[PDB]
Each structure stands twice: as structure tokens, then as C-alpha cells.
Nucleic acid binder design. Structure first.
Lengths: 136, 37, 128, 272
RNA sequence: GGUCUUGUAGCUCAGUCGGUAGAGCAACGGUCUGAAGAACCGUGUGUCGGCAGUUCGAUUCUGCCCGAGACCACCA
RNA sequence: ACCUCGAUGUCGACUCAUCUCAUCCUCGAGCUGAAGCAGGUUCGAAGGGUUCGGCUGUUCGCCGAUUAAAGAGAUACGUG
RNA sequence: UACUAAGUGGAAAAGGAUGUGAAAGUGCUAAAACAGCAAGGAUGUUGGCUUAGAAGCAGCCAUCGUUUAAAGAGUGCGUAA
């Protein structure tokens, strides 16, 4: 439950995640960044799985910076229900990934560790991961 | 004979071959045999 | 082939010198008598076929690396090479170089001293 | 079965007449039938004979090690016992300090200076602790090498006879044994496996199959003999394991080396 | 999926709608007691289910989550 | 909510079974933490076959025994 | 003018690819490039700790110094050594 503390509305239109970056198109605090070639929804489950995949192989010297947060959510209607009752309750929180944006960056650790971590975590998401080096 | 979706040399002897446009990996150890990709 | 690294005492246990065809007692007596002057210090020893390998032995000139431990003001070996205990004078190093002068496969003072430095930079003592 | 054990004794006593080189006992440590012979087929035909001629039908057992118990320091102790029984009532409050240490056994210290307890109740609690040290919380194994230091106590009016103190001490010792999470101890043995380097690789493999201690080799005057520190429980199958891999070309000796704290791999089996 | 309820001490229970965490028993010490029953004084235990807000300040007020409890969801 | 309700015979049991391999057995073969026996994994492979009883309407499901093994998915969960 | 060897064309995903053709940065080489082949590949060095025996090679401290085109506590294999 990566919950934004205050939510005026919790039942918005689902998401249209296709679109280019609206900022943070450069590696600011880290040295290797994860670029997305295709936007998507990510539930808290996949976010946590990717985060722990990175952290398991993350060394003591290295430091990580997140560039995303589940600012959105998603509901879910159970099975065998006739269509139309309003909308369901938000079951979890959704991070929206626009294509061309960077979600995570790493630094303060040798390059081999960074690239191995990124290649290791790339298979945890449907999004086609791409590696990006240190930017300004 | 095993099937995967990725083939890289796991060992230093795991060479990659394409017999009849059919990809296989051959290594000194007979455990290290696979074919796909 | 079948090189042995042993002390100056007996030769019973080592399965590298007496495992080629040389009898145990007939030469362990000779070694423990002749090398008695050098008993307690290791001497690497090598062997080769003579015509049946009934007896063919030779010993390398004894290196001072074992005595480099006591030259380092130590009584027993140390795991780390970053620990310092005591200080070694230059005369001891010169005597070490001259002692292994006929031991080292080369012959010159500077090379022997630098080689001792190299095997002592890892041992735990920095030569002077 | 009890009758099975009796007929086993009858068969083995007569089988000793036919073959006196094995030894038969009943273990005061586990109660099993302890049969000692010299080989797989030998024991197999022994059981075959006692089931054919003497008609003794019994399945196979499993040897075990007594795994004695030690533990850590207790808070002090808090022992209480209040019951109306024993021809009268019974009230008793005790607080000793009971410290386990494998260097010194049962040392009892008395520190009464204000008169909190008479000397008539010192020997009772001493005896109670001495006889209650024999049982443990894990599996009843003895709690050895523990020192007792009496510090506080309290009795009632003309009530509270002697046995109240002993019962309170037993309850306190039980609670103390439960709270300190005790650990076990097994006798590790030295095994002098003998082989003229013919099956030395097999020796390393077989030793490592029991998590082992393989570190090097040494020679005795005509052969090479290897010292291995082995637990007692895994040696019973290790006999036929070593015999099989060496193809019946190896002998050894089993003697008490020292008592070592059980590894957690043995400890996890006690929790209930 | 809604209709709601339940989780509090070692046991079972209330919970000044915010102004506290509480006995009894589990269990301990003392006191009285022809003996012994007897009764009393009191040792001790409490993320008050968890997380967030609200609130002077939260166990209480609000939302979410987890464990449990009952209401329906394939026909002419 | 789609053709079909001036009718689209639907549960089960027996019989015809047929098809398909994402093969259960029989088979070829590779590898092994595959001494042998006994194995496990995997590719090919449909030529052939894949038991009977007690119980509940019962394919479901339970039990028992047995065979090289006693497969699974489909045909209006086929068949008035 | 070019590509293709999948009948791709003439159905598809992530992923994989020592695939093919092409383009550009740069290096080496006929004083002969990567080879293969013929060779050396040594030395303190069982360096010292570890477990009586762990010692080019379980592992650990240093992880170097000499002859020297070059030799590495060795590139791996093989031993408890």
C-alpha cells in the first residue's frame, strides 16, 4: 500500500499511460537509470518485487534514488457481477509509467554491480527496460 | 536436450552452434546442453 | 616431479620423496645425521631417476625465508602482512642475501634483496 | 514387545554360546537392545538365525546419543509453593542463584545474616537441588555443573513443614530450566581410519557425506592413518558406509575424544 | 461484491461519546485463624488488533488493512 | 444479450466411439546428485492400447482389488 | 540498383542471438596481424595463518620481487596436503 497520504478522489478514470516524458528525463542523483520504452500500470506488488530485486544485489556503498511513486490507483470488480454499479473500491496503488521516462537510478558503486543489477531486475516488469548511463 | 528462451555461455566451454539453423550449446560437461533462441 | 618441502628432522611422513623408490631408513639415517646441523629448518628437496630410482636425491640450498620469521622479530608465523612487530637491521638482510646467493637461480645482491622484499612484503615484514 | 525382548534375550544368550564374539546388553541410557558384532552380513545372518531357529521376529531399531544438556545464566530464581497438603499446609518462598558452568559442579553458598531462614532448611534445599539437577526440560537429560547460592527465603507460622522448601526449589529449578533456552552436548569421537592411501579419496568422500572433518593425512610407520572427529550417532551407518566404499579394506577405532555442544542441525529436533 | 459486527491483561469482561486502561480469576507476599477453614490488604500483567490521519493530547473520533462472525448473488 | 425462444430435446447410465498430443503405457533416444536393479529429467513419437467391482441418479467423487500402465481435452460438458 | 534463404513474404508477445547485408571511430599486419603447430612458461613459493597434515590451485594477509619477449600465490583442471 504505497498510499499517498491525502486523496481527494480515489476513483478516477483508469489511466492513459501512453505518452512522452513530462520531466525527469535525465539521471539526476544516480549514475545508471532505468528508461521505459513503453508506459504501463505497475501495482505495488511489482514495484516491491523490482525494488527488492535491485536491493538484494545492491552493495553497501551504492545508493539508489526512486523517480516514480504510485500517485494513481486501480479498482477491481469481482467475478459473476452484472455490469454497472458505479465503480469499485481502490484495491491497490498504481504507478503510471510514461514511455521515455526514468523510474530508478543508482550510484556510489562500481559499474559492473550497477549493470548486473539492472539486467537482473529487467525481467520483473512487462515494460521493456533500457539502460541509461550517468547524465546531467 | 533442454529448452529455454536465452542462450549465453554459462561455462567457459559452452560454445554456441547452429546445426541446420537449429541453435544448440555444447560444453565439456554433458550437463550443459540446451537448445532454443 | 615429486618435489618435497620438509624440515631438517626425519623423512618418514612425506609421501613425495620416499614415494619413488628410495628406501626410508637407509637415507633417513644419513639425512638426520648430516643435516643434523640444519635440523629444525626446512630444506626443499628434489629427486630424479638415476637408472631405476633406487637412490637419487638432492637438496636445494636452504633459503632463509623460514628464518626470515625470526629475523622479523617473530616466534611464530602471522596471517596478516600489515602487522609490524620489531625492527630488522640491514646486516641481517645482507647475510640473508649472501646465504641465498647460491640458492637463488640468479646471482646479484640487488635482485636477491628485492626478491626477499617481495616474499616478505607478503609475509608481514618490510625489509630494510 | 516385552515378550519380544525376553525372547531376544533367550536367543542371544544361546546365540552367544554358538558365537561368543558379539556382546549383548540392555542400555541404561536408552533401554534398547545393544548388540555388538562385526559386519553387515554377519548381523543379518544373526537376525536370520534368531528368527529361524529361535523364531524371534523383530524389526530394526535406531541407535541414539544421550545429548546431555547445559544452559545459560538465570535471572536469580523465583520459587513459590503454597498447597494445603501433607498432613498440614505447606508454604514456601525461595530465591537462590543457580549458575551453570562446566568447570565447577554443585557448590552451595549460604548467605543468611539477618536470620531470614534457619539452618534447618539449608540442607533440605541443598538436597532438593542436588536430586533435581538430574532432569532437564529438553528431553529429561541431566543438567550438570550448576552452582547454587541461597539468598532469600520465607516460611509461614507453625505451618510450612520441611517438604514445602523442597517442592518450591523443584518448581524454581523447572522454571529456570525452561526459561534459559538450554543447549545440548554430544561426545565427539576420534576415528583413526586406516588405509594405505588406496581409498583415501573414498575416505574424504565418506567423511564429507556426514559433514565431516577432512583436513590432512599422517603416516604410522607402515601405513597412513587419518584422524577424524565424528559424532557418535552417525557412526553406526558410517561403519557400513566406510566398509562399502573401501570394499572391506579399512579398519578404525572409536574412542571418546571430548564433549562438544550439539550443532543447531541436531538442536532443531527437540522443539515441540 | 455489498448489509454490518468482532480483536482489550496469562482467562472471561467494561470501556467519563478525549480528558483512565480497570478489578476477579491464572499467580505471589502479609494479616487475622483451638489447628485448619475463613475474610481482608494489597506484588505483578495491559503497542486497549495493526497502519494512517483527527484530536491540547487517542484505547475512545474517522478512514484503510489483516484474523473471525452471520445475510444473496448459474432457470421457465 | 450475438443468430435462435410460431421450441435452439438439454442431467446421468449403457452402446458408436472418433479425434488430438500438452504421450499414461509400449518404443527410440539424450542427460544426470544415472555402481547394477531401481530411477529422475527431456525431445521425438497417435501404430496400438489404457481393468473391474461396492456407494451415492451420477460422468464428479470415495473405497477396495488388479495390469506394461490402469492419461488428459473435445464433439449441444456427442449421441431420446 | 539491393535483400532474402525463413516459402520468410504468407499470423503474433517478452526474450535470445557468435545470424546476414550496410554504414561510420579507431587499431594491428607483409619488418609478416589472430591463430594452429614447435616451445618455454622458471624463482622466493608447503611465502605466513587455518586444521599434526589446507601451502601455484578450499579459503584468508599481502595478492608482490628476481632472470626476464614471459611467467600469473599462478588459467583453469586434479588432491585433506
Amino acid at each position: 500500500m504505497l498510499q499517498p497520504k491525502r486523496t481527494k478522489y480515489r476513483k478516477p478514470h483508469n489511466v492513459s499511460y501512453e505518452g512522452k516524458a513530462k520531466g525527469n528525463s535525465y539521471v539526476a542523483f544516480g549514475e545508471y537509470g532505468l528508461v521505459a520504452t513503453k508506459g504501463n500500470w505497475i501495482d505495488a506488488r511489482a514495484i516491491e518485487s523490482a525494488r527488492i530485486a535491485i536491493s538484494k544485489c545492491l552493495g553497501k556503498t551504492g545508493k539508489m534514488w526512486i523517480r516514480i511513486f504510485p500517485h494513481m490507483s486501480k479498482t477491481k470488480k469481482p467475478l459473476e457481477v452484472r455490469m454497472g454499479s458505479g465503480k469499485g473500491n481502490p484495491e491497490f496503488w498504481v504507478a503510471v509509467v510514461k514511455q521515455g521516462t526514468v523510474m530508478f537510478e543508482v550510484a556510489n558503486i562500481p559499474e559492473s554491480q550497477m549493470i548486473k543489477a539492472l539486467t537482473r531486475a529487467g525481467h520483473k516488469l512487462p515494460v521493456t527496460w533500457k539502460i541509461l548511463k550517468r547524465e546531467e | 536436450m533442454k529448452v529455454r528462451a536465452s542462450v549465453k555461455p554459462i561455462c567457459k566451454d559452452c560454445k554456441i552452434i547452429k546445426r541446420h539453423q537449429i541453435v544448440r550449446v555444447i560444453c565439456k560437461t554433458q550437463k550443459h546442453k540446451q537448445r532454443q533462441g | 616431479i615429486a618435489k618435497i618441502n620438509l624440515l631438517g628432522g626425519q623423512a618418514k611422513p612425506g609421501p613425495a620423496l620416499a614415494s619413488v623408490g628410495i628406501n626410508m631408513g637407509e637415507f633417513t639415517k644419513q639425512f638426520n645425521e648430516k643435516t643434523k646441523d640444519k635440523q629444525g629448518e626446512m630444506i626443499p628437496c628434489v629427486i630424479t631417476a638415476y637408472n631405476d630410482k633406487s637412490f637419487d636425491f638432492i637438496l636445494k640450498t636452504t633459503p632463509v625465508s623460514i628464518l626470515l620469521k625470526q629475523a622479523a622479530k617473530l616466534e611464530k608465523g602471522a596471517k596478516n602482512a600489515k602487522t609490524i612487530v620489531g625492527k630488522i637491521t640491514m646486516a641481517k638482510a645482507k647475510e640473508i642475501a649472501q646465504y641465498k646467493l647460491v640458492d637463488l637461480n640468479a646471482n646479484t645482491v640487488e635482485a636477491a634483496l628485492k626478491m626477499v622484499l617481495g616474499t616478505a612484503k607478503q609475509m608481514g615484514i618490510e625489509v630494510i | 514387545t516385552k515378550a519380544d525382548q525376553e525372547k531376544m534375550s533367550i536367543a542371544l544368550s544361546k546365540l552367544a554360546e554358538e558365537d561368543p564374539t558379539f556382546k549383548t546388553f540392555t542400555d541404561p541410557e536408552t533401554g534398547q537392545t545393544i548388540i555388538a558384532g562385526m559386519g553387515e552380513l554377519h548381523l543379518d545372518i544373526l537376525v536370520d538365525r534368531m528368527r529361524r531357529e529361535f523364531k524371534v521376529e523383530v524389526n530394526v531399531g535406531a541407535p541414539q546419543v544421550s545429548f546431555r544438556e547445559t544452559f545459560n545464566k538465570e535471572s536469580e530464581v523465583e520459587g513459590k509453593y503454597i498447597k494445603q497438603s501433607g498432613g498440614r499446609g505447606q508454604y514456601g518462598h525461595v530465591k537462590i542463584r543457580f549458575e551453570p558452568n562446566k568447570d565447577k559442579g554443585f557448590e552451595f553458598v549460604d548467605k543468611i545474616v539477618g536470620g531470614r531462614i534457619p539452618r534447618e532448611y539449608i540442607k533440605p534445599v541443598q538436597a532438593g537441588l542436588e536430586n533435581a539437577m538430574a532432569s532437564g526440560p529438553l528431553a529429561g537429560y541431566p543438567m550438570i555443573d550448576i552452582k547454587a547460592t541461597l539468598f532469600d527465603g520465607s516460611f509461614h507460622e507453625v505451618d510450612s513443614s520441611e517438604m514445602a522448601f523442597k517442592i518450591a526449589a523443584s518448581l524454581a529449578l523447572k522454571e529456570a530450566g525452561k526459561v534459559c533456552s538450554p543447549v545440548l552436548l554430544e561426545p565427539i569421537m576420534a576415528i583413526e581410519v586406516t588405509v594405505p592411501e588406496q581409498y583415501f579419496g573414498d575416505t574424504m568422500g565418506d567423511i564429507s557425506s556426514r559433514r565431516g572433518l577432512i583436513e590432512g593425512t599422517e603416516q604410522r610407520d607402515n601405513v597412513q592413518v587419518i584422524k577424524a572427529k565424528v559424532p557418535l550417532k552417525e557412526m553406526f551407518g558410517y561403519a557400513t558406509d566406510l566398509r562399502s566404499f573401501s570394499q572391506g579394506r579399512g579398519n578404525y577405532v572409536m574412542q571418546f575424544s571430548h564433549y562438544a555442544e550439539t550443532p543447531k542441525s541436531v538442536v532443531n529436533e527437540i522443539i515441540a
